[PDB]
Amino acid sequence: MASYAELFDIGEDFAAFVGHGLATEQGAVARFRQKLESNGLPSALTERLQRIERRYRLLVAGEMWCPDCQINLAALDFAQRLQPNIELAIISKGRAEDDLRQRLALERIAIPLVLVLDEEFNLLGRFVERPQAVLDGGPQALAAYKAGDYLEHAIGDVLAIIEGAA
Residue nearest to Mg ion (CB): 13
Among 2, 4, 13, 52, binds Mg ion (CB under 5 A): 13
Residue 99 annotated as binding site: no
**Which residues, other chains included, contact 12 with Cβ-Cβ below 8 Å and sequence gap of 6+?**
20, 89, 90, 91
Task: Please tell me the distance from the alpha carbon of residue 159 to that of residue 145, in angstroms, as a whole number.
Answer: 19
Please choose, out of 11-19, 84-92, 122-130, 137-145, the segment that lies near Mg ion by the rule CB under 5 A.
Answer: 11-19
Site string for Mg ion, 16-55 (x = CB under 5 A): x---------------------------------------
> 3-class DSSP state for residue 22?
coil
List Cβ neighbours of 69 (8 Å cut-off, separation of 6 or more). Answer: 62, 63, 111, 112
Q: Give whichever of 13 and 118 is closer to Mg ion, judged by the CB atom.
A: 13
DSSP label at residue 12: B
Q: Which chain residues interact with Mg ion by CB under 5 A?
A: 13, 16
